């Protein structure tokens, strides 16, 4: 993720005066991803005995 952070200031107006300008400056940050796992196993006779109850 990033940041923008603008900048700039104004002065008084004039016909032949210099023109002020603006700018910006950015930064970033990081994170990490984790994964998990889980499974199952079933036998043939186990299902038959389980259906009794």
């Amino acid at each position: 993720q990033g940041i923008v952070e603008p900048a700039g200031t104004a002065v008084e107006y004039g016909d032949h005066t210099n023109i002020p300008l603006t700018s910006w400056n950015a930064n970033f940050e990081r994170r990490t991803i984790v994964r998990g796992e889980l499974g199952m196993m079933v036998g043939t006779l186990e299902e038959g005995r389980a259906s009794a109850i």
Binding site: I3, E5, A7, W24, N25, A26, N27, F28
Partner: protein, 53 residues
């Protein structure tokens, strides 16, 4: 004056996003295989066989 910039000033664009990667890859050569050019190839037998007469 100039207050505080809140964020640390730095170069905005990272090195990435400015790199183009060539579409291809290089592979290693290994020694030449010249048996086919000298002699040729004949497909006469079949798999799971044992002998040629």
């Amino acid at each position: 004056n100039f207050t505080a910039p809140v964020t640390t000033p730095s170069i905005p664009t990272p090195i990435q996003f400015l790199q183009t990667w060539l579409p291809g890859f290089v592979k290693v050569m290994t020694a030449a295989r010249k048996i086919d050019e000298i002699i040729g190839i004949d497909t006469v037998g079949s798999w799971e066989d044992q002998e040629i007469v």
